[PDB]
Each structure stands twice: as C-alpha cells, then as structure tokens.
Symmetry: D2
Subunit: 260 residues, 4 copies
C-alpha cells in the first residue's frame, strides 16, 4: 500500500513509536527511526525492520528537545531516505504533579518536546512535501489533547496545543496533496504508562495488575488497553488514498474515553 | 480483509451508500443493499457486486422512515446474509429553508430517516452482534453533526443527534467486541448536493461549475470534493481489527471543514 | 435588570424551569409559565412570582409534545405578555434503558418534547423577535448534549440535536439582535434526578444520600449538584447586553463534567 | 456585586485587559493592573479606575514572559491587595506567517506569554485561593483555542494549550470553591487586530474600514466586533455565585464563529 514511500518516525526506538515504524515498513515504506536507548537494542530493532519487511531502515540520533537539532534531524532524515513523504511526530514525555507543585524545568521539558518539537519538525518537513505535491504529517496527540486529567497540566497543555497546531498545518496546505491529522490514543501499556500503574500500585498498596485494572476502569470504557499495533494501523490508514480528504482532524482510538 | 463478514448498508442503491457497499464487498464481505430507484438499475448493481468481488449480495426494499419497517428490514437482512457483522446506517435526505419557514412535514421526515432510523436499525441489529461477541455499527453523520450551517435546522439537528447516539451505542457495548463510530463527511458531489449546486447557479445566475466551486470554497478548505470511494475506504478501516479500540467517536473526512 | 422584557419558559411549573422563571421575574421581566401538575400548586407558583417580584405572571397549559399546540402556545404567550423578547425552551423528560430494550414510544416521546418542541417553539417565536430586532432564545440542553452516558440514547440524541439546532438558529439570525445559546447543566437535584438516585439506592441497596454522592462522583468532579438558581442566573446573563455577541454556543454549568 | 473582592488582570494597561479591570472595578472589586506602556498613560488608567469606581487600584510592571517575574508579580499583587480572589490571565501577543516561514523566536515568545505565563501565574495564585477556600481563575483564550486559522500556528497552539490548562486547573481544584474557565473571544477591535486590518487594507489595497468589514465577514457571522466592555461583563459573570459550579469550560463570545 505504501511501497516507495519514505517515512520518518520520531521517538521510535520503543513504545508506540516503534510500532508506528514497524507498521509503515510492513506497508512497504523505507523508515527512519529515532530515539534513545542502548545502541545494541536500537540496532537489533532497526535490522529487524529490514529482515522482516525488506525495506531500508535507517537510524538517526537527535534529542528533539533541541530546536536546531530537530530541524537538522529532518534534513538528515530526508537525505538518508531520498525524500520525505510521511512524518510521524511521536516522541513525548510525562510528569505527574499538581499545578502548584509542578517543576518549571518539567513544564519546560514537556512543552519543548511534546509541543515545540512538532512545530520544528513540521516546519522543516513542509518545504519538501510542498515541493513534491504530496505529504502526510501524523501527530501523536492523546485523549488528553481533547479532555484533561488532574496533575497533568504541562502534558494536557502540550497535547491540546498539538491538536491546534495540527489544524493550522492542515489549513495552510489544504488541497496541496498534503494532510495533517492527530492520532489521539487512550491508555497504551508502554513503560510510560507502567510508571503510573506502579505509582498506583504503591499509593494504594494493591496488586500490579489490579492497579492496571483501576487505571483503565477510570478512563477507558472498554476496560482494554489500546495496542501499539492498532495505532500503527491507524497511521497506515491516514497515509492511504482513502484519507486524501481527511485533514486537520483527530483520530481517537481511546476505547470510549472521549465518548463520555 | 473482511472475508466471511456480513454487511448491511442503508440507502445504498446510489450515492455514498452504493460506494460503501462496493468497498465492503471488495474487501470480501457479503452485503445487503437497500434503497429506491429503477429495479433494473438496482438489479444490475446487486448483480455486479457478486460478479466483480465474488461475494453474495442481496437487495431489500424498505422505507426506513418507518420504525417498524426498519426493524423488519434488518431482521430480513440478517436472515438473507445468514448473520450481521457490520451495519452501516447511511440512508438520509435533505431540505433547505430558514427555521420560521421550515415545513413541519419536512422536519418530521428528516428526523425520521436521518435520526430515528439510525436508532431503530441499531436496536434491532445489536442483539445479533451482542450474541456473537463481535460487531461494527458505522453511522454516517456529517460535518453538520459537529457544526452548523444556515437553513438546515432539521438536518443539523438530526446529524448532531446521530453523533450523540453513536456515543451512547459505544458506551453500552464497550469491551463486548462491538464498536460504534460516526463518519462525518464534508461535501460529496452526489444528487443530494447537486440539487444545492443548482440552487446556487439559478440564484446568482452563474455557471453550474462556478456554483460548485462556490459551494466548496465557503465550507471545504481543500476546495476538493470528498469521494464516495474514500468514505467506503473509511468504513473498511473502521471494520478492521486496528479499530478494535476505536469506538464512540467521529471520523471526519471533510477537507478541513471542521478544522476552522 | 430586565424591566420591560416579556419572557416565556416551557416546563416551568417545577424544577429547573421554575427557577428559570423565578430568576427572570426577579430580574424584572413578566413571565409566562407552562407545564403539568396540580392546579393548586401551579397557581401558587404563578402567584408567588407575582407578589414576590412585582411582575405580571401568566400560566398557559399545553402539551409541548404536540407541534401545533406548542406553536399556538407561544402565540398566546406573546399575546398575554404583549410581546416576546426572551424564550426559554426548558421542558424535558427522561427514560433510562439500553438501546435494544428502549421502548419506541419512549424514544418518540423524548424526541418530540426534548427536540421537536424546541424547533416548533423557536419557529413560532422568531418572526416576533425578527420584527422587533431583539430577542433571546435560551435552550436548556445538557452535558449530554456534548457527551454521552449509558442507557440514555433518546435523551443524549435529543440533547445533541438541541445543541445543533441552537447553532443553526444563531447563524440564521446573526447580527439581527437575536441570539440563541444552549445551557448545558451537569446534575441538578430535581425530581427527574431523584428518580435516578433512588434506582441506585434500591439497586445497590445503599443509603439514599449515599446514592446521591455516588451519582455525583461518577460525572461531576465538584461533588456538588448544580442548583436551579445558578442556572437561572446563567439565563439572566445570556439575556444581558454583555452577551449580545455570544450566540450559537453552549454554556456548561456541570461542575467539571465535560472538562474530563 | 464584587465589592471587597481582590482582582488581578495581566496585560491590562490597554485593550481587553484594561476593559476587564474596568468592569471588575465597576463591580466594586479592588484591582491590580499590569503591562507595558508609557508610565504617564499607565498612571492615568490606574487613576481613573480608582476615582471613577471608588475602589483601590495598583499597577505592577512585569514582563510575564519571565516565569520567575510572573510568580513574583502575583505575590506582589496579593500583598498590595491584601489577598487575591480573582486572577485574569489576559496578556498575549500575535504574529502571522506560514509554518515553514514562522520565525522560531516568534514561536517561543508566543508560547511563553500566551501559554506558559498562564501556567506560572496560576501556580503562584492557587496556594493563596486554596487557603481562603474561594477563587476565580479566568483565562483569556480565543476562538483559536477551539478552532484554527491559517498562519497562526504558534497562537492557535498556545490558545488550545490554554483551554487544556484551564480544564486541568478546574479538575485539580474541583469542589474546593475555586473555578477556572476560559473566555474565548472572537474578533475584538484592539490594536492587536487593527494591525491585521491594516495588513488587509495594504494588501488588497482597500479602504481601512472596508478591510475591517471584510475581516469580520470571513469569521464572525454576526458581522459585529465583540466589545471589550462585553468581555468584561463575561468575567464579572464568571466571578458571580451563579457560576460556582461552572468550571473547566469555555465561554465563547464570538458572534457565531464557532457555531459553523
Ligand atoms: N502510553 C499511552 O497510553 C499514551 C496515550 C496517548 C498518547 N501517548 C503518546 O504516544 C507517544 C509515545 O509515547 P509512549 O507511550 O510510547 O512512551 P515511551 O516511553 O514508550 O516512548 C517515548 C519514545 O521517545 C523516545 N524519546 C525520549 N526522549 C526523547 C527526545 N528528547 N527526543 C526524541 N525521542 C525521545 C523514547 O526513548 C521512546 O522511544 C507520546 O508523545 C505520548 O504522548 C501515549
Ligand atoms: N452528499 C454530501 O455532501 C453528504 C455530506 C455529509 C453526509 N452525507 C450523508 O451521506 C448519506 C448518503 O447521502 P447521499 O449524499 O448519498 O444522498 P443520495 O441522495 O445520493 O443517497 C440517498 C440513498 O438513500 C435512498 N433513500 C431515499 N429515501 C430513503 C428511505 N426512506 N429509506 C432508505 N433509503 C432511502 C436513496 O434513494 C439513495 O440510494 C446520508 O445520510 C447523507 O447524510 C452526504
Ligand atoms: N435534573 C438535571 O440534573 C438536569 C441536567 C441537565 C439538563 N436538565 C434539563 O433541565 C430541563 C428541566 O428538567 P428537570 O430536571 O427540571 O425535570 P422536572 O421533572 O423537574 O421538570 C420538567 C418540567 O416540564 C413539565 N413537563 C412535563 N411534560 C411536559 C410537556 N409535554 N410539555 C411541557 N412541559 C412538560 C414538568 O411537569 C416540569 O414542570 C430539561 O429539558 C432537562 O433536560 C436537567
Ligand atoms: N483582539 C482580539 O480580537 C482578540 C480575540 C481573541 C483573544 N484575544 C486575546 O485577548 C487578550 C488581550 O489581547 P488584546 O487584543 O487586548 O491585545 P492588546 O495588544 O490590545 O493588549 C495586550 C496587553 O498585554 C501587554 N503585554 C505586552 N507584552 C506583555 C508581557 N510580556 N507581559 C505582560 N503583558 C504584556 C500589552 O502591553 C497590553 O496591555 C490576549 O491574550 C489575546 O489573545 C484578543
Ligand atoms: Ca468527556
Ligand atoms: Ca468550526
Ligand atoms: Cl481526572
Ligand atoms: Cl452558514
Ligand atoms: Cl456512562
Ligand atoms: Cl483560515
């Protein structure tokens, strides 16, 4: 479906990000993964992409909290691939705490990566897409880009901002063959979520899996986690021709989170 | 991808409904088509579904503006197909006029088909899906189920109603293997819209195509119509395993209509 | 102050509606109340409005589930008042049950009163307001006009429809000195809710007040009911000159219900 | 209505901010104004507030793009007022340009003032309100906090982020007697907009008032500017008891902008 396409997924050495690339490569596109982690684990994950899907899978390192590094990352990603058709701004972090106790450094970090990096990434990639007359920018927002939760001020603020940025990107390139949409996932059991599950496990002194059940129960009606593969599935769909007129909107796979 | 699945599409003898029955059949699903029109045309359409995609297709005439007739409809639809996995509530009508001049009969008519029919169809289909532990109810709302336009009170109201009903449907069956989502299309150049394109032409006394380009400009940022095939592509996606945790939400393909 | 203004409120013989009337009379406008109930209790309510606020208060009976009756209702009200500046479509009913078990008569009764009556009421009032060049149509929707809850398909669909109808009314009359907005309340402890609190109290065999605290904890972060008086305050605000440019939007008073 | 209350409004030396302080002072609340400008002009506004409405009024300068300075500012404001009941985060700036051409320094300045400043101001004031057990945090967002417009990436991103931050603030203090809401204005003819009106007057080479008339038509169906005095009345309302259960939501005064 996406043979010959060139995809770039930020923060893809693990979690949802890795699943994104895994699904894009499976669809036939050459992928550029990015993120942190042990060099070996990264290489093994990269090579596995080539072995299983027979596509060119490159790896570029870049700390996206750095504005210039992110923009350089895009140009470098384009050179390795020979172009840039699909951009997935996935990288992001979290920190829990009430507003009055939220560390300025934490607020700045979350905003820098979860919001500003989408901008810099989009800005550097748009010229390439505008020139080609085709493109796909897929921002990974969250149910938290639509509604809020306590003690997540910076995150909820960044995600909401991502949703708005997504809308602007779409309007500025409407009808140019370029679309911009935001995937808003519900709970996905990655290390980012296990941390919150573990905190609950201690605070309430309950079973680990009982805590995970509690975390789901409060926000996800299905009482089932969203899977990284499923989200990858969504990205593949947004990159299809059937989504040619889908732009500046949100794609919620949250098991009912925002229906109530 | 949908081999062995059994689908039903209301208002599918022409326009968007037909294109969605086509995409589903093309995906491997047996289908039940419905609507009005010349019998020979309807037959040729039912006939081509079976020959082109090697699936079983059936046609059942029923005026979904009637509650009981709608309930009889899916009942017979289920018997014909030998089940019911995917239900697409698509049949709808339009009527333009300011509120103080809107005909009571036109209001009742639109709420009846565009909204109540969705409820009756869903209520009759759910027991079958609930029993199986799997199901997909795809409602066709509109960008007008999220925002409004002048002189479309009954339609915007009903479309908004469908979005609410979609949410309730998803919540009641969360985790049961059943999901309910609403496709919210922007401008699709079908007869329902051509009628509005002609009203503009005869109004400003301008080219019919000049009227079409004026229709888009005012609401659809892309300045490109959404195609029936693209909507069907969306239905196929909602029906996939990737959308297992996508429920109670809206899928907008409106060329950026709702982004601004 | 609303001295000189003529206000009309449907379903105002008790509950939110009565508070709506009470706050408008207090602000200085003459009001016409409507609804069912014991004539003794109704005359008391009507009479209290008169002696407590020094305004004229009339009572007009009419089952708003009847399109014509409602249209005749606002015609008389406008006659008894000597005009019509503020209209509050408040009348509403509720039935709780899952879709597949939802009685068709209940679905029809809810749509007819909760949605259709809002359209007919508006239709008949607009010509009068359009002629004066000033008007206010305040629709009492709900948090269920924006989000959903299990077993309230007809109600949620109806309320979502009111939100849409509100947007249309507003656009069709933009700049004419007429605004239309929907107040969307969270839990308000009226006889409509008490019935739901008791069903919880009996169902789970818990204290009646413990049922109330549970009902709130599930949807209202503030853990405090919204009061009919507060909602009446909102209407008075929507009727003020400060709200001249507020139109086609929703006003949520739900203790944070929709924030999450 | 607000006699004895203590209010703080950022960016209140001119424009919407000053109108907010005015209506608050008029309502009887002591106010603290802030913002840039010539010292004599600033003193004048502070002076008129004091004598015209007979309340206390102080001016505290502070470049709110400085986290530490904004936190110190509210500490000084509370000290000057002898408490802090109402905080209105109004300060904001704009810059128009396509994403790929958007200056990074402009992106940073907008996020810092339009979004971060709201966070820091809120963080510093909550402890004070939490102690008294009563509070109002009114955030001035925009229609651009719910929808988008071309060439306003940083601004839309920021405003959406403010909408999200508002919800978190409200949720973290649900029931504590503290509410947080976001006023979402449409076009308001302040210097921030004149600049944009002039740009159209120049580009299209048309009348300055024709440009102002044209700026309205594209987004505001009422074809009327929302006035500063009206937004001030909105803030006065949000501070009233009727809004005790109104929290974590948006109050749109956009003349129908978001209705379509
Ligand atoms: N887990 C959920 O339930 C959930 C829900 C909604 C949205 N999301 C989002 O999905 C995206 C991925 O989150 P996740 O759950 O996979 O977390 P994760 O911890 O599993 O993954 C974060 C990925 O980004 C890398 N990363 C770290 N710092 C980085 C930096 N400075 N620059 C670039 N990459 C960096 C990580 O090493 C990792 O590969 C995020 O932005 C997060 O908002 C997650
Ligand atoms: N055309 C657009 O731009 C557009 C935009 C948004 C949503 N939609 C929706 O797409 C769906 C299909 O609309 P359309 O544009 O294809 O219109 P259409 O006129 O092209 O198709 C309507 C289909 O329903 C049949 N129908 C007529 N009365 C019926 C009844 N009582 N019961 C069952 N079927 C009946 C029609 O004969 C036809 O096959 C609708 O509900 C409409 O809301 C269309
Ligand atoms: N109670 C809540 O928590 C809550 C929350 C959100 C919205 N609402 C809405 O507030 C409005 C008032 O609801 P309520 O709680 O006061 O219920 P209520 O039972 O207390 O009041 C309903 C009013 O309408 C009258 N009514 C009955 N049938 C009528 C008819 N055919 N025509 C005209 N009036 C009729 C009633 O007798 C009564 O005076 C409604 O539309 C309901 O949606 C209530
Ligand atoms: N004008 C509109 O149509 C409109 C529409 C929607 C939202 N808004 C918002 O209303 C709020 C006020 O905007 P405005 O139209 O009055 O613009 P303005 O230019 O008229 O006012 C900005 C106020 O903030 C001060 N300000 C400048 N830099 C500052 C800083 N670093 N720290 C603190 N204050 C600073 C200004 O000097 C001025 O007093 C804003 O955040 C803007 O988003 C305006
Ligand atoms: Ca919600
Ligand atoms: Ca819109
Ligand atoms: Cl929460
Ligand atoms: Cl319109
Ligand atoms: Cl629920
Ligand atoms: Cl725009």
């Amino acid at each position: 479906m996406l043979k010959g396409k060139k995809a770039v997924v930020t923060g893809s050495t693990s979690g949802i990000g890795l699943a994104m690339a895994t699904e894009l490569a499976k669809a036939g596109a050459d992928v550029v993964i990015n993120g942190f982690g042990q060099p070996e684990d990264i290489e093994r994950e990269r090579s596995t992409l080539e072995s299983k899907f027979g596509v060119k899978a490159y790896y570029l390192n870049a700390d996206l909290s750095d504005a210039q590094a992110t923009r350089d990352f895009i140009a470098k990603a384009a050179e390795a691939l020979g172009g840039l058709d699909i951009l997935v701004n996935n990288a992001g972090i979290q920190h829990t705490a009430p507003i009055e106790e939220f560390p300025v450094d934490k607020w700045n970090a979350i905003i820098a990566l979860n919001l500003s990096a989408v901008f810099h990434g989009t800005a550097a990639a748009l010229p390439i897409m505008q020139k080609q007359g085709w493109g796909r920018i897929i921002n990974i927002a969250s149910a938290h880009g639509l509604v809020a939760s306590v003690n997540k001020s910076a995150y909820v603020a960044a995600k909401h901002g991502v949703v708005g940025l997504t809308k602007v990107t779409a309007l500025e390139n409407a009808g140019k063959g370029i679309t911009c949409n935001a995937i808003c996932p519900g709970w996905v059991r990655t290390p980012l979520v296990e941390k919150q599950i573990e905190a609950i496990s201690q605070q309430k002194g309950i079973d680990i899996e009982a805590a995970a059940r509690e975390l789901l129960a409060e926000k996800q009606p299905s009482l089932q986690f969203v899977t990284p593969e499923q989200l990858g599935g969504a990205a593949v769909f947004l990159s299809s021709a059937a989504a040619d007129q889908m732009t500046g909107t949100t794609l919620s796979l949250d098991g009912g989170w925002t229906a109530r």
